[PDB]
């Protein structure tokens, strides 16, 4: 039989827990045991890939959504998968909200069995993103769990599942083996017979195994990866596609008129952006785990499927390392070294220095700021690194006293989480607001576009909305995007082929729990033997 050796997580020892609703479970439970209704391929525009459902449709008013269940799907014990399972599972999370790890109860007010193979979700808000959120919620077997005395402690050690790997073939403290569902609805597509899951205590133990070609699918940091791993074996590969954006935010409402003269000037923001060497920041501060973000809108290569490439290309030159271009733009904009001290003054002739902050102890951010300070000095922009404690860094943004700040941003499946949290002016005021929108650039058309993004279920309309957002942010160079993080991923072609890669970039490739596309990925693999 073909065994695929995977490492979704580290453990000090294997504890047999396949309850998909508990934080303490094994990280091969979701997707591989409990298959979703739909897997959203987030890298491909968040396009739905229909699995246990064959379709869904939102109501015209976006207040409900129906899913058509695929007929002929079996649980691993042979019983039919039906709407009863979906209704049961959402009812369990409503009754036991400690099992609702994602807070789906906020969005779904009720779930209706329309017929044996159709379920209707009634929603608390007109919101076309709720199908995506629904897709993340594990669906368990009503005919089993109805008999479970306490689902919040149930370890589910003999799981009955819909997904590809439900058979607990081997379970020991050091290793478990999870073998193919003998009733799998998509069995013809599944060529891997079992997941082999070794107990690995830490990243150093993983390193020794991966360089010896003992693993197939991993998602860990590998030091010196090209020399020690990738170049060492023609079967050793990796692919680190772009994840979440990180950027310098500038304070458009800086109280200091000299600093405001610089920061509230689009040519200055573009020159600041051209001074940065993003790839060197990624290589030094982030150990190589990232991708340059050269989108003026911050969209990033994670969401290239959403990009208007005309807009990206028009402003990409302002977000590329270009020392001579940076100096030329500063001069054209009137930022000239008038006193000869090596640094540019504002067009009105005022000296200024930008205080660039990141949180104390966040070493990767701290090193990014220091690198940026040196890069900015090369074009004549006077900057100093500051490392206040997080509460002070955050307060300076909430109160609008900071100059420039380096920050990351929330992760989302589409560009809305980044663009809304990072730019909606409604998030610049109020009790409890986080830092992410506190550049104090305001555009009410931008706000309206964001507020409309999930008020349509038409993807062509959403793409048009995204393109309008992208244009507004890019043409104003609102922030200075630096980099995108990495979906960490290494793969071995010794025993299997079909892997996703830069040459075959079919989706997010990581093996982590929480990556629904790992189900699609394992269905593309083929044993060499
Ligand atoms: Mg000067």
Author numbering: 1 to 529
Text taken from the publication that reported this structure:
Periplasmic solute-binding proteins (SBPs) specific for chitooligosaccharides, (GlcNAc)n (n = 2, 3, 4, 5 and 6), are involved in the uptake of chitinous nutrients and the negative control of chitin signal transduction in Vibrios. Here we propose three-domain mechanism of the (GlcNAc)n translocation based on experiments using a recombinant VcCBP, SBP specific for (GlcNAc)n from Vibrio cholerae. X-ray crystal structures of unliganded or (GlcNAc)3-liganded VcCBP solved at 1.2–1.6 Å revealed three distinct domains, the Upper1, Upper2 and Lower domains for this protein. Based on the crystal structures and molecular dynamics simulation, we here propose that the three domains, Upper1, Upper2, and Lower domains, which correspond to domains I, II, and III, respectively, are required to explain the translocation process of (GlcNAc)2 by CBP.
We solved the structure of unliganded protein (open form) at 1.6 Å, a higher resolution than the VcCBP structures formerly deposited (2.2–2.3 Å resolution). The unliganded form exhibited the largest motion (RMSD, 0.8 nm) of the entire protein molecule, while the motions of the individual domains remained at lower levels (RMSD, 0.1–0.3 nm). This clearly indicated a domain motion, in which the individual domains did not change their own conformations but changed their relative arrangement. In unliganded VcCBP, strong self-positive correlations (red) were found in the region of residue No. 1-239, which corresponds to Upper1 + Upper2 domains, and also in residue No. However, strong inter-negative correlations (blue) were found between 1 and 239 (Upper1 + Upper2) and 350–440 (the interacting region of Lower domain). Furthermore, inter-correlations between 140 and 239 (inner Upper1) and 1–35 (N-terminal Upper1) were rather positive (red). It was clear that Upper1 and Upper2 domains move unitedly in the unliganded state, but that these two domains move independently in the (GlcNAc)3-liganded state.
